[PDB]
């Protein structure tokens with residue numbers, strides 16, 4: 001059965017149990033990620049801020065089944081429009097809130113991308129997205145507050161496309177990890 005993670009350690013524990021196979025029960029993953037109550041002292045080692053944009057901080061490589069990671073968000077920090085490389089994507093807020101702008105995959109004309117829905121992901125909630133559903137932008141709308149979000153991606157992926165909101169054009173991007181296991185990694 002799915003047990004409540006009492007700490008980030010206990011959450012890491014269950015995740016390795018959930019992905020101990022070949023498929024993914026997205027349902028149970030989102031409930032337990034949501035069930036772990038964020039404890040700042042437990043994940044502060046991974047939340048390394050960068051003044052300019054957001055960064056990705058690896059927390060656990062999931063024995064190859066997934067890359068768990070934390071992405072701090074300075075005031076005003078946000079992403080371009082992107083996809084998730086045919087893999088699952090879970091995003092749980094550990095601190096603050098984030099704006100999520102949903103978009104459909106562009107047709108083919110060099111047309112503007114109109115949002116298909118938006119929402120504020122709240123501190124401690126866990127959302128999910130995958131390519132079949134559609135794309136999204138992530139943005140910390142705050143002017144004086146930093147956000148921290150815990151992401152789960154399976155299978156792991158480092159490359160993905162960004163999409164221009166005015167044309168639907170796409171470009172491949174190969175993301176990098178700011179830190180790995182509580183160590184800066186230039």
Ligand code: NI
Pocket residue numbers: 082083084089136138
């Ligand atoms: Ni995303």
